[PDB]
Amino acid sequence: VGEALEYVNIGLSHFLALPLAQRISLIIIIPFIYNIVWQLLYSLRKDRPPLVFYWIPWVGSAVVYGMKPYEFFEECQKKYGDIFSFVLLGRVMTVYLGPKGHEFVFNAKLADVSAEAAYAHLTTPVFGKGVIYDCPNSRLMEQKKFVKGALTKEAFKSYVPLIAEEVYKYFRDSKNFRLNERTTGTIDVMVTQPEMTIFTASRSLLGKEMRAKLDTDFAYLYSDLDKGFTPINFVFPNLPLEHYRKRDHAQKAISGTYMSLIKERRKNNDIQDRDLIDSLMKNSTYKDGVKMTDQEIANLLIGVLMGGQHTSAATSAWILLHLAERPDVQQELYEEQMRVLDGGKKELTYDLLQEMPLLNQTIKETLRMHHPLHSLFRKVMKDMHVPNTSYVIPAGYHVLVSPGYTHLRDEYFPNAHQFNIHRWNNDSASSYSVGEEVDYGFGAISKGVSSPYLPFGGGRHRCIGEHFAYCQLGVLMSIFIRTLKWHYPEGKTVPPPDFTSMVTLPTGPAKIIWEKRNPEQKIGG
Ligand code: HEM
Ligand SMILES: CC(C)(C)[C@@](O)(CCc1ccc(Cl)cc1)Cn1cncn1
């Protein structure tokens, strides 16, 4: 019976001929049926880690992952252990939880994975081109060296009074404070902290000129650039809407202002050591001998400040929120402040910051309970074997590492969900290499990445801003502590994190009430 083949033919014709009702209905029910079958087949393969089950094709587990990612990882971990996959808006994520997860993704060979491949679609439109994830990795490595060159301890001794000047200036003039006119008030930390962060960062990393442009309408351009830095730009990076354009406008606009200042500096020889602009001018020639274009330098500046803006500001928000219900921790930090700065007589210096271990433990502890990035990604370039398993992660897959999840595990942190800065007694450093090191182009960093506290990651893509963040957060918190007490409004406590955004920032409005420690103190100027 090719008479049966006559009928696949006939049947095919009747399919194309039935009402639109059933056809759309079939255009739905066929993919739904197919993927459900496909998964059951997949669950038989054992060169593949267990795939989380999902009903909606393409979308996969994006809803629950997007909303409560650590909760997703946990029930996932109970069911399948530390390695498992799940489908996310078209892509396939293989999650490896714990320190071996860190090792498998952060220390992965350059050939196995790509961060550029994972991130460029989201970062390049915001930062500019020619830099970060819009160049070969080797270039990235040299840029990180260029930037890290302006992040030296002597830069930090110069940044500390600039940053303090800013915080004080903010207490003086900001509508949310007015310390020379108010002794008490309410602020939204989600409003205060991003302004405080951009002011301090701008002033210290981009110099006084660029800090000054933030008082004008120009500031709004940073705010535009800011909203194009969203996970939506990670799925649909370019659809003709409209926040997508103001972003691009802002990119050239902001990048324009930097080149303007850069070109005028080389043209007057105004190239001192003031900021990162001076520094990137004096030092941005690759080792093959190519030099960064003035455009490229500017774009590297947008990227630095943008990255540093969101992590830092979220973190100082959390510090305020956790402290707001711990007058005991405030009392303790204040005593240290009095001891190290001789009641206040001594002026804050980068050196003196290092003698404030409790202040540094608070940043350490907050960064433990609140990692700004719940998920780091790579695209898999070559089929990877997972040690001590038969598992193969084929190329074209994505790997996902999550040190912020381990941070919150009792196993590695007794009472992980309690805020306790004393868990870091005689252990206050931003991080430290528990042994041997390795150098990827931007200096010797730890070779192992099996530390269960890994706030800044590791491997070639490891953060180079930890000492800047601590410096800024250090000055900022030091001053808050000496100037203010603060607490929650009645019946208000720590907000749950909003995971859907770029950084795990708190769910606003997150309000605290400040009062002056010295009502009659006046900030001068
Ligand atoms: C609390 C503050 C911060 C935290 C928790 C943090 C966290 C991280 C993490 C986890 C990574 C690795 C990402 C990955 O491997 O996929 C990273 C990378 C990086 N961070 Fe930070 N960061 C912070 C502040 C900063 C600051 C202030 C700067 C700039 C001054 C900065 C610049 C960078 C750069 C340039 C990379 C390199 C990424 C790469 O090479 O692929 N970060 N950061
Ligand atoms: C890729 C992404 C998650 C946005 C990112 O890791 C990387 C951002 C980033 C990358 C390169 C430069 Cl030169 C500056 C900032 C977030 N982040 C981490 N530390 C600071 N920002």
Author numbering: 8 to 532
The publication says:
Lanosterol 14α-demethylase (CYP51 or Erg11p in yeast and some fungal pathogens; sterol 14α-demethylase in fungal phytopathogens) is the primary target of the imidazole and triazole (azole) antifungal drugs, often referred to as demethylase inhibitors (DMIs). The CYP51 enzymes of fungal pathogens and yeast use eburicol or lanosterol as substrates to produce ergosterol while their orthologues in plants and humans use obtusifoliol and lanosterol, respectively, to produce plant sterols and cholesterol. In order to better understanding the activity of DMI agrochemicals, we have determined how selected antifungals interact with their target enzyme using S. cerevisiae lanosterol 14α-demethylase as a surrogate. We have also determined seven high resolution X-ray crystal structures of ScErg11p6×His in complex with R- and S-TBZ, R- and S-DPZ, FQZ, PRZ and DFC.
The hydroxyl group of both enantiomers point in the same direction toward Y126 and Y140. S-TBZ binds with its phenylethyl substituent anchored deep in the hydrophobic pocket. The smaller tertiary butyl group of S-TBZ is positioned towards the substrate entry channel. The central quaternary carbons of the enantiomers are approximately 1 Å apart, with R-TBZ projecting deeper into the active site cavity which easily accommodates the smaller tert-butyl substituent. The key water 743 identified in the wild type FLC structure is not seen in either TBZ structure. S-TBZ was found to be the more active enantiomer with 15-fold lower MIC50 than R-TBZ. We observed 8.7 fold (0.64 ± 0.11 μM) and 11.9 fold (0.87 ± 0.06 μM) reduction in susceptibility to S-TBZ in the Y140F and Y140H mutant strains respectively.
